[PDB]
Amino acid sequence: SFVEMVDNLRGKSGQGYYVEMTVGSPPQTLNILVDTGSSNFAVGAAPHPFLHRYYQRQLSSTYRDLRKGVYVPYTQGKWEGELGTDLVSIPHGPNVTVRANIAAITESDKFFINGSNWEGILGLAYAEIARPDDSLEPFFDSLVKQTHVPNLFSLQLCGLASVGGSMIIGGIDHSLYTGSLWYTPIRREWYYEVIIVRVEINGQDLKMDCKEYNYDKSIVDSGTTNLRLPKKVFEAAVKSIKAASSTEKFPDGFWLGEQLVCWQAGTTPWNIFPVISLYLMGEVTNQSFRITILPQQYLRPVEDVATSQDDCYKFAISQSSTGTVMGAVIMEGFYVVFDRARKRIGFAVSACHVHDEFRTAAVEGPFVTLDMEDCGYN
Numbered sequence: 531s532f533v534e535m536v537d538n539l540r541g542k543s544g545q546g547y548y549v550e551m552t553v554g555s556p557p558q559t560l561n562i563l564v565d566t567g568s569s570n571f572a573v574g575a576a577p578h579p580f581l582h583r584y585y586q587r588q589l590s591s592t593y594r595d596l597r598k599g600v601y602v603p604y605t606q607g608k609w610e611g612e613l614g615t616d617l618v619s620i621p622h623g624p625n626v627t628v629r630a631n632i633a634a635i636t637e638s639d640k641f642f643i644n645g646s647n648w649e650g651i652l653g654l655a656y657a658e659i660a661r662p663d664d665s666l667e668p669f670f671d672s673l674v675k676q677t678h679v680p681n682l683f684s685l686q687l688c689g690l691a692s693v694g695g696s697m698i699i700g701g702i703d704h705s706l707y708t709g710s711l712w713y714t715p716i717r718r719e720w721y722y723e724v725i726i727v728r729v730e731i732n733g734q735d736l737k738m739d740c741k742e743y744n745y746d747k748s749i750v751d752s753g754t755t756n757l758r759l760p761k762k763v764f765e766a767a768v769k770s771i772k773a774a775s776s777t778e779k780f781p782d783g784f785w786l787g788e789q790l791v792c793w794q795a796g797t798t799p800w801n802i803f804p805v806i807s808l809y810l811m812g813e814v815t816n817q818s819f820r821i822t823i824l825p826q827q828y829l830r831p832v833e834d835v836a837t838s839q840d841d842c843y844k845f846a847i848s849q850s851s852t853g854t855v856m857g858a859v860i861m862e863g864f865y866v867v868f869d870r871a872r873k874r875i876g877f878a879v880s881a882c883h884v885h886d887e888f889r890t891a892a893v894e895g896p897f898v899t900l901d902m903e904d905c906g907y908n
């Protein structure tokens with residue numbers, strides 16, 4: 531039941547949200563990062579200083595070796611391993627056991643994070659971006675094929691350092707959001723690719739050709755902390771946020787995410803910072819809806835006992851050369867429905883949210899733009 535799935539996610543702020551899973555027979559319990567930005571189920575399978583436990587294939591009678599290596603290098607770090615299949619279950623997910631592909635990580639460099647409490651990654655995106663290639667069926671594809679679970683999942687990421695949330699597999703739990711769910715089409719089934727049609731900072735349009743917001747794609751990624759923007763959009767956004775917050779001046783390093791800004795505990799001047807709205811393409815021509823975030827979402831607290839006389843924050847909007855990434859900055863405080871069956875992503879205000887007494891994060895619409903331009907970059 532969905533009620534049994536509520537609060538099945540845990541994590542440390544900015545370290546990743548994870549769900550408990552079991553692999554093998556007899557079952558081995560592991561904490562697994564929920565990642566909508568990748569498509570491999572990859573688990574630590576050898577000792578590592580940052581791993582409390584790991585997958586021991588020799589203890590699983592149901593393990594099957596696929597006799598195929600896999601090497602996956604990312605911008606920061608890389609993982610090498612071996613492919614196989616085994617029985618997998620989600621103790622606080624659907625009441626089912628399925629056979630799924632598993633990449634057993636045997637060597638890695640700067641992939642596992644100290645103190646993150648996760649031992650692998652559940653890539654929830656599509657086969658097109660699976661490694662080594664699209665013939666390696668992702669976990670959610672196997673789950674849907676082998677069971678009667680509907681082809682949809684939803685995430686309620688709720689932003690001390692400990693975080694929580696819910697991953698609801700096979701449905702939408704109405705207790706997790708308020709107001710209406712607004713849907714944007716999935717443009718291509720690879721990443722969860724979407725289209726942004728307008729960006730406003732404190733109600734002021736950035737006034738760019740909308741293709742700039744999607745250069746070269748825009749994705750929804752629970753495996754990325756920041757709201758990451760293409761260079762041109764990022765520079766305009768920083769200029770606009772600086773203009774709104776000009777009563778206080780911060781080091782250049784802050785706007786580049788290289789330095790923290792600190793205030794005496796409880797004194798953060800939230801009202802000098804603007805709201806940011808991303809307008810997403812609707813399901814109907816030239817209609818859109820907006821997602822509006824507050825500074826409590828894009829100025830992320832950095833927990834550190836040593837600086838705890840203050841509240842210290844990192845600016846969580848950053849530049850990208852690979853397109854827009856709607857990471858946790860966007861997802862936390864919203865209930866996000868990955869409706870794979872209908873090729874669409876829904877957004878609603880979450881039951882767990884940031885609102886202070888002046889402003890509230892929102893999901894609202896509809897908005898019309900009679901300008902007929904397609905905002906898709908490719």
Ligand SMILES: C[C@@]1(c2nc(NC(=O)c3ncc(C(F)(F)F)cc3Cl)ccc2F)CO[C@@](C)(C(F)(F)F)C(N)=N1
Nearest residue numbers: 543544545546547565567568604751752753754755858
């Ligand atoms: C597979 C890959 C990947 N992701 C992570 N993620 C995290 O550790 C992480 N996750 C969520 C959050 C929070 F919840 F706070 F947002 C904070 C963190 Cl710090 C770690 C290793 C790794 F290889 C590739 O890199 C990206 C980012 C890719 F570049 F592909 F986008 C991705 N999506 N998945």
